[PDB]
């Protein structure tokens, strides 16, 4: 069944590890591993599996559809700030709270790691009260808990300073430039990770056509153009009348 899986790693980067810290219900450091020939996450309904999926996805898109699968069209009750706060419905981590996330990969046996460090310095939860950073490493000498310790030594400037100290390490305060760096490192256009998000919450395969539409292809429907089309036509109508 899986003996043909020898191509993984030898030919492409594959997922190997994940780490977490003060994320969702995972209070404190928590970890997992991944097998080359494949793996499965299991547990009772509503136990933190899609939570881990979202925790991974936070690092691979401008924004993923958090909780895409179980919502079934429902709005994303889960998001970055609520995850850092550990929301359910009673906030797990109010006041000042710190958080950390990471993922890992391998190609030719050489390691890669992603991650991001978050923390509110106040009980309020504005998008700017969040102090955030993102990371990308092509060197085995980087791990999430080491990043947490580094932050415990100091702020974002320290996460950049250790980047300057090592080689094969990158960190960024803005998500877009980190995403661009990683995408260049993989030549990946962001539509690829958009498709990854489409797949990472897809339920039963309905039909091949609807599947092309909803997964393979971005919507990009021109209804946004119709609004200004109508408004400009009304403007012309004013002068004509």
């Amino acid at each position: 069944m899986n003996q043909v899986s020898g191509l993984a790693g030898k030919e492409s980067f594959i997922l190997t590890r994940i780490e977490l810290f003060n994320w969702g219900g995972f209070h404190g450091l928590h970890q997992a591993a991944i097998h080359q020939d494949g793996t499965a996450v299991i547990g009772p309904t509503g136990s933190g599996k899609t939570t881990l999926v979202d925790a991974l996805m936070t690092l691979l898109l401008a924004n993923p559809r958090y909780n895409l699968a179980s919502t079934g069209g429902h709005e994303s009750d889960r998001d970055l700030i609520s995850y850092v706060r550990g929301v359910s419905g009673h906030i797990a981590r109010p006041g000042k709270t710190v958080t950390g996330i990471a993922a890992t990969l391998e190609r030719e046996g050489k390691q890669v790691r992603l991650g991001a460090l978050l923390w509110f310095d106040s009980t309020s939860s504005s998008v700017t009260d969040m102090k955030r950073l993102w990371l990308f490493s092509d060197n085995p000498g980087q791990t999430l808990e080491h990043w947490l310790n580094v932050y415990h030594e100091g702020g974002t400037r320290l996460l950049r300073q250790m980047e300057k100290e090592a080689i094969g390490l990158w960190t960024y305060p803005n998500k877009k430039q980190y995403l661009a760096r990683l995408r260049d490192f993989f030549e990946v256009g962001e539509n690829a990770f958009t498709l990854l998000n489409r797949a990472a919450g897809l339920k039963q395969l309905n039909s091949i056509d609807e599947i092309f539409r909803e997964l393979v292809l971005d919507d990009h429907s021109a209804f946004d153009r119709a609004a200004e089309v109508a408004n400009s036509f009304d403007g012309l109508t004013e002068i004509h009348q």
Partner: protein, 50 residues
Amino acid sequence: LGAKALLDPRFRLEFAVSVMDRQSGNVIESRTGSQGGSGGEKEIIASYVL
């Protein structure tokens, strides 16, 4: 929702189910609204009411 809240009788009322003590008028526990992730009790209460 607003229009129904005016012109539909059964939308002027919020509903909740309060568990009663057979030996006391007190409410052991009341179930309604968003549970937030746990529903082992809500399921049985709603099924029982139906």
